[PDB]
Amino acid sequence: SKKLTTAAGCPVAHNQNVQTAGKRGPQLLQDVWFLEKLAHFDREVIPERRMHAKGSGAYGTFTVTHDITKYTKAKIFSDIGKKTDMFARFSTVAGERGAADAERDIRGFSLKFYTEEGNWDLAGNNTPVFFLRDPLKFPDLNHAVKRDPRTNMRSAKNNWDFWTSLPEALHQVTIVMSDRGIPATYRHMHGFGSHTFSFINSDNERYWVKFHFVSQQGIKNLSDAEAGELVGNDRESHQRDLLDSIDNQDFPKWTLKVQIMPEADAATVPYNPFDLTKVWPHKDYPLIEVGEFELNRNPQNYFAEVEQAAFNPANVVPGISFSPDKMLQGRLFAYGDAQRYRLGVNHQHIPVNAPRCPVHSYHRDGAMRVDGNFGSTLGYEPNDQGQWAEQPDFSEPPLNLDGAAAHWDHREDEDYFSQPGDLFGLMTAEKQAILFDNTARNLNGVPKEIQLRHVTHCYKADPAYGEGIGKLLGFDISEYNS
Amino acid sequence: SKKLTTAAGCPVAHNQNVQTAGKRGPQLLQDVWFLEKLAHFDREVIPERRMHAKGSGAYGTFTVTHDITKYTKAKIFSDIGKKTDMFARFSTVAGERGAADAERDIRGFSLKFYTEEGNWDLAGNNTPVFFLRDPLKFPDLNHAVKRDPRTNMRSAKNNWDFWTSLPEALHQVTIVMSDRGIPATYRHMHGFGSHTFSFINSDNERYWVKFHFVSQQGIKNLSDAEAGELVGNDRESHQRDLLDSIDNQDFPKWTLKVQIMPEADAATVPYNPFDLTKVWPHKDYPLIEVGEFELNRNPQNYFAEVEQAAFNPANVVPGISFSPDKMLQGRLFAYGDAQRYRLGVNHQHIPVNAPRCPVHSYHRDGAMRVDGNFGSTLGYEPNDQGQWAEQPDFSEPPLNLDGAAAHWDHREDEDYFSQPGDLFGLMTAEKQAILFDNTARNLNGVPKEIQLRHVTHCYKADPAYGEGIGKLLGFDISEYNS
Amino acid sequence: SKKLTTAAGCPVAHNQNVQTAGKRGPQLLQDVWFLEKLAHFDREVIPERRMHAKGSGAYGTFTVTHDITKYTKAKIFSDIGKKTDMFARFSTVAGERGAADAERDIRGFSLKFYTEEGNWDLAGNNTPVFFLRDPLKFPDLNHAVKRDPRTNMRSAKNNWDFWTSLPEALHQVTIVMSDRGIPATYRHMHGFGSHTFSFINSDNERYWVKFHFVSQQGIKNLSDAEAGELVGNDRESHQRDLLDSIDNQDFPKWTLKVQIMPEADAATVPYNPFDLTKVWPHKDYPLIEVGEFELNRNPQNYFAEVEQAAFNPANVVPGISFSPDKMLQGRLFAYGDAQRYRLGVNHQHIPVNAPRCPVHSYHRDGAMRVDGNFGSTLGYEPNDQGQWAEQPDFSEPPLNLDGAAAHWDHREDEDYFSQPGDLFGLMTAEKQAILFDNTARNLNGVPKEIQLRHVTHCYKADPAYGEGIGKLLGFDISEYNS
Amino acid sequence: SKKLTTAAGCPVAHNQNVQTAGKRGPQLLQDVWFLEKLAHFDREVIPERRMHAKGSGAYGTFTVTHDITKYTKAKIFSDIGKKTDMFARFSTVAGERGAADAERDIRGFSLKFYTEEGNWDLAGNNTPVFFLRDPLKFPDLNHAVKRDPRTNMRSAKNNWDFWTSLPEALHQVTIVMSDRGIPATYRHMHGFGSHTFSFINSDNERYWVKFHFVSQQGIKNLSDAEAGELVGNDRESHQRDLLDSIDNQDFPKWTLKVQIMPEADAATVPYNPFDLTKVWPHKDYPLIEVGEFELNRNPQNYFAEVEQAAFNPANVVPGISFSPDKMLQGRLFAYGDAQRYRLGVNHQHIPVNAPRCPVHSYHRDGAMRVDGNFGSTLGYEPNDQGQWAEQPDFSEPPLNLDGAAAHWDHREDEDYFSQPGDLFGLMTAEKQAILFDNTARNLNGVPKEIQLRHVTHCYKADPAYGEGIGKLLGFDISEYNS
Numbered sequence A, B, C, D: 001s002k003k004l005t006t007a008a009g010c011p012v013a014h015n016q017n018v019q020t021a022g023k024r025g026p027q028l029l030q031d032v033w034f035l036e037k038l039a040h041f042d043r044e045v046i047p048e049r050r051m052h053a054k055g056s057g058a059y060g061t062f063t064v065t066h067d068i069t070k071y072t073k074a075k076i077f078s079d080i081g082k083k084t085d086m087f088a089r090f091s092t093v094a095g096e097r098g099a100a101d102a103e104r105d106i107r108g109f110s111l112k113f114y115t116e117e118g119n120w121d122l123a124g125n126n127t128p129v130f131f132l133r134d135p136l137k138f139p140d141l142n143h144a145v146k147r148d149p150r151t152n153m154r155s156a157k158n159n160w161d162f163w164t165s166l167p168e169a170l171h172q173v174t175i176v177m178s179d180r181g182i183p184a185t186y187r188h189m190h191g192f193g194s195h196t197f198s199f200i201n202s203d204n205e206r207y208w209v210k211f212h213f214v215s216q217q218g219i220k221n222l223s224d225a226e227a228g229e230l231v232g233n234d235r236e237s238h239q240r241d242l243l244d245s246i247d248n249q250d251f252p253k254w255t256l257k258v259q260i261m262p263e264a265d266a267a268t269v270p271y272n273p274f275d276l277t278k279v280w281p282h283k284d285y286p287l288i289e290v291g292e293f294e295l296n297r298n299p300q301n302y303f304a305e306v307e308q309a310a311f312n313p314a315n316v317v318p319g320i321s322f323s324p325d326k327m328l329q330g331r332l333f334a335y336g337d338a339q340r341y342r343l344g345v346n347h348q349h350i351p352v353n354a355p356r357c358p359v360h361s362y363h364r365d366g367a368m369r370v371d372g373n374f375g376s377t378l379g380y381e382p383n384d385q386g387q388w389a390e391q392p393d394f395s396e397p398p399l400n401l402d403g404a405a406a407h408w409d410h411r412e413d414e415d416y417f418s419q420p421g422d423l424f425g426l427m428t429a430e431k432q433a434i435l436f437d438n439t440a441r442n443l444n445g446v447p448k449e450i451q452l453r454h455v456t457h458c459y460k461a462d463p464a465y466g467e468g469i470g471k472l473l474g475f476d477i478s479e480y481n482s
């Protein structure tokens, strides 16, 4: 029971010395434990995630505290006090596997709720917005923010050339360059679904919805100087903090709140409600409390439960659906796809990914089939056994459409600057000074014409925002005020 | 259960019609069930086995009937009446996935015994010998007996050019060209370990051993004409027979018998006891009966239990070990290697491959890790927790060695023809004529110089053997006389 | 040079005998040539195709004979006498690698044209129609026509339960049960795109199109009895014929003809023009001649050129596009998905799949990257280098849409029987008798209620069609005439 | 030029906006550029190396300066002034992709020489020795020095529990805890083959050999405090240095020197000459200058040329071979094994891995076969076409052997401490204080019984070594005495 065996269950007699042809002779092929042990060792590693490769996870419990059942029939939300198992992974974005935790970056805020009608995956971020309006730009973002093909290092030129070429990116650039760019720990940041999603209620009415997760620990951040110091001591600071806190029974909590928009308002609101680079004003759609979750159990094995974790935005549950946010649409393809490659087609048989409700999922065979493959069950539908029966009671209402099939130009909406301006305007002088200093030092070494492209965008958001950065870089106002 | 869900447990509402932009419009990406179902479908297939790709499997039970505990300490054989669950896979060799069952070919006779001290895999054949003396020639044999690189069809010239270049191959060539080359069913053929292996007893004494599995149904074969007729009707004849026999409770049995040679005898016998192209004469080493098995249960799912089955000759149990047969030696590497590629590093977690005894196998991580991965258990040994403790009481005795590390030429042993001669001499005239006819027709269209090479080898086995084929082909006796 | 080396170019001295500790000792691990040779051998096999696994390929040339540039701007059709190289693969559907060539089945008719504006893949069939109207049924078809999960054999019950559950399948069921179900060779069958596609001209006007490939060798078929005799002798009959025909310089040819439907007609025609189970009457849309191709070159290596060939219906070229045929829509996802799994992400660097025109494809990294990965070229767009510039001149016209996003029920169109009834009406008494016999024998052993379901459908197509099978099965007319 | 196409060479019209059902409608599946672009993106990542994942590479040139042709027939050394092109990768050991360059760790020093008789791979380290005597302990070392299964962080307890269990590890622990544990740059460290290898001359005589690479830039190191400050600023410090140095034409250089031991001396020397934890004293075998290499080209693409680089210790060339060092013997299996998994079976067709000399490597098929697969060339040997002809002229002489096949206990050699003591004795008082300090801070938080185990080992090496650490930890000399 601490006794070593082979994978086939044979006792291992020799784990210290290989078999050789005499004391000083070469090694024998028939040391098969050596061959097995090293062959499994040689295959421990699987591909990292193409985005958010560096991260930390924990298990917890979501509890309903308020009634939103008029808007959604989702079983997770059905009764006050109702508890649901869940799993969260927090992460950086650009960093690879052993990259520093405490970098200036978006943080992933990824939740799996093990509901009675399926795993609901909400792969959120610590920001309500993102850089892009169209998912075609996503591989380009990755290539701009990660390592240069030649230098194998991040390139400020590549990063800023790309960002300055997409004025719609200004909102999230501002957020990442602000004081919230480096949370002090994963417990001291908020979470967001970011996208507009939808709620479907008992009567098949549709509402557009935003998910908000409010930290009960409050917001705490690190300056570039504090982060560099921390990173020099510990590339694993945020993992360390999450693990230690839960082991110390200091369980972090977040309050789920939602914004809910009747289907019809989408046609009338002054902002595109499906634009990922924009929020819905709280004045227009106030936050509505729903419940809270708390993270209260560390995984026993990081590789099995965290590295192998897969969150798919397409994994929704009755009462929760998508929206025509083009960014969300693209994500409906890319995650299942990336996860089948990264983890194997049968990766939902990995415990962390498995439903904790009845599952009868049809798909047969595939690599590493360990669940019995449904035994002798026939594989085709329609069939004379009524096997693999669809469930029409769960059918969503149609969605009205208007206009031709085409590549519609998102730049028809040129409101790239007002929401960033609003954000900047709300900052204290200290927060504005931090913003300015972070941006200016990030722009160091970046070719002047790219710098000026950014300063111009900041100016259009708010003249004080452009000027704050322009002054630090040594530009005359005339260079960026047109 | 009948109701259809996604892999994440979400009810599936539409399994008949995809989502489109209007009745006559193009398909929408947000049909996420379509993407999941097709993405899994697209990944059902895994690589087939490189050898013995076509096969049939069943479960059964082995029972000890005689006491051989004087020679082996293996728990499987420890008590008369002791029963052990097992899995068997029968197969052709050259045929791919949907190739005909009823071909002229060796048949695989592969057994997995779920013992209390590990899974014992014996991947045997329906013949006591093989074509080759050295494992380097194995890929060459595959390339000669399978599809030509250009034609994509088997090539008589490739096959016979290769066979005629290895005079040692004559024993197994004679067998495959004899009436035994096409068993009528898997139930009407014998099985053999083929290789010399070893038994180790309670006092750590070593014996060399051969395993023999004698069909209790007896031997039944098909002629080329009968097999062709059958194949034309049914490429699945042997699967159908095996499955149907078991479904009608006519369970096939085999009797295990062994030859046992004291270790010291191997230096004194007139033949090489580790030459896979040779048998041990029954006169020198009589068959010693051990027990019997029956196959009494069909797999519920063929892909998960038969296709994914992995038999590795290196999976031995205490009391059973290997020998210096170079062919056996090469197989100690190749199977685990082939199986990690074909099935994944964690394939021993697939139920058919899993031990039924205690397993504490050390290896961590790897693709599709579903077993918990030993949780938080440390991964290194030596350690201060007594974890992963080796088991020195199961240590095998040393093997004495003599001579330098070198590529010793097996052709020092030029006894290529005497055992084929003995086999031929024991055939009735009808069996000899069948041999002559099968060989002559197999050699059809093969260049004459290659045909002559084979006829010469046959003549050297027995003059009547060479002449029997020589006459059919129109050769003058002086052409192969010398 | 024919001298043997390692993969790293080191001379190999010993390819006949492995290195051992003495003449009769165990094998040494340091025989690294053995390890490398067997490790590569162990990895020769990749997954077969999930459908059409069994096949044959050849290179050839397409030549334009007629002017259709009024309808399409595609460069392949731009000038009379213009030659374009191509590769074709013909195949069965249900058979695995190694299954019989001469089975009753659809034949794949897959073409890759190496045009100056990209590879145009047309993955067609030897039939103008198919069994299904909706791509969700495809994995079900696979599972119904291939091996039973338990028996590992084809199942008449599974196949016919499935087909009788889909009355729309009757058209293709009729075709596959007719004398055309077994082509005598690949050269003696027609090819079809089957789907409605589109042509776009210089003025961006869209026409709907069907592609027809008319065999210049004529149609030749085999009966079940003739096919059985052939299979019994040769599982590779159609490969043998194609290879041998091309080596003998008897190059097979087909004439490309098209049906062309103005965009506005689609709304007015009495049949759904995007229904894969229906053809467009030649009376309404006569065949328009375009050109011809001949296959004149056998591949040098079958694995590298044929097995590794990837045909993706999404690989269209300017002037050729898709249609809202839901079956074609589903294919736009499945192939590239299946192919990246089967062949690797970078399979388009395999010579057979590579374009023979300017290519600058942007995708970076991925497994087995051999093309240089664009060197130091930056990887993001937009960028300040004008790199990865889109080509707006090649933009397609918008497609007009109407109606809500929904899973629209295709069974709104209940015209299941008229086109099968028409096809039957065109058959001679002899061809009808063959159809009746083929169907009755195919329904042998199938549960009576399933048989009756098919006969009922055949009855509704034409009373004589139903009665022909009904008689052979011993049914009274009252059992199926309602 | 600079224009975007699909992988099949079709021009891409829309790279900014995905195709939707109207301006604000959901995304259409038929946007096939989106699917292709995202599917390739989703598959960019391959597994990182199991050890030495973090690294930097460059191309250079080796020049022979002096004559050692008396001892080796290797072509690379055959003539003074002879130039050989090459590639080098330098690396850390424990860090993943993204981990800091400037950690306390062994550095990998890995060389590929493109010789006229094969690629000679020499995967060395920046140290002449290593922690272990037996290759079975390698996965244990990985699991001890990398991330704990539960915490996902490195563990001082795990690491030192393991190192203190292996007294033989002291030599390398001393070196990694010394000032040379953090090279300032890759240019400012030495390289070593570490293992005893062999040289074979024109007369087939064998010499044992050690390879040394002496930095022409000198040795320069960073203290823990200096390294932490650097890491806080830049995780890519060593990549940055190597890249910029070469771009600045400041080409780093190393002189190759060898130690050469006649075969006979191996039995007479007072140290095991095949013990990887030991050096050969310069007193007995002085360094003999051979040539130098410079690194003078940065790779064009890091992924394709550095990440995909594979160095296999078994890739030796005529004139150079192995030794019975158990650790070297194990590496002969593991690297090819790991690389086939990580990179694909055909990874030696990746340009950096490709030989420039004649290559005729035999192996057929396998994933991503892009080289032509030897076209129609037959695949078996022996054959009648002279194909795949072995090269017996390059045969190596036999190695005399003595003793039984057994798992021989290396702890028969109890000389664990003398060489670490010799090294300690040669350090200045300042470098000794640095050693004490690095070690004592490394032991922080490690259970006292483990700490004491290490101090005991150090004392055995030299009383002042043990006392130096003992003092800093607050132990009395009597607690770790003798």
Ligand code: HEM
Binding pocket: B038, B042, C048, C049, C050, C051, C052, C055, C089, C090, C091, C107, C108, C109, C110, C123, C124, C125, C130, C134, C135, C136, C138, C192, C193, C194, C195, C309, C310, C311, C327, C328, C330, C331, C334, C335, C338, C339, C342
């Ligand atoms: C929703 C409908 C369909 C789906 C999802 C589907 C799926 C597939 C898949 C996954 C493959 C293997 C691809 C590969 O690995 O390269 C394949 C092969 C093939 N299919 Fe389809 N199929 C569909 C309908 C059709 C139709 C309607 C046709 C004819 C018009 C067709 C013709 C072919 C041919 C010719 C091949 C073999 C291509 C080759 O020679 O490599 N399929 N199919």
Ligand code: HEM
Binding pocket: A038, A042, D048, D049, D050, D051, D052, D055, D089, D090, D091, D107, D108, D109, D110, D123, D124, D125, D130, D134, D135, D136, D138, D192, D193, D194, D195, D309, D310, D311, D327, D328, D330, D331, D334, D335, D338, D339, D342
């Ligand atoms: C039992 C002993 C050892 C085993 C089993 C082992 C195993 C491995 C493995 C699996 C890798 C990753 C290989 C790849 O994916 O390309 C690796 C990398 C490496 N190892 Fe070893 N190792 C051993 C000892 C050593 C020793 C003694 C040295 C130095 C003399 C060394 C130097 C290196 C270097 C430099 C690399 C990275 C090669 C590169 O730059 O791509 N290793 N090792």
Ligand SMILES: [Cl-]
Binding pocket: A340, A341, C340, C341
């Ligand atoms: Cl994949």
Ligand SMILES: [Cl-]
Binding pocket: B340, B341, D340, D341
């Ligand atoms: Cl592998």
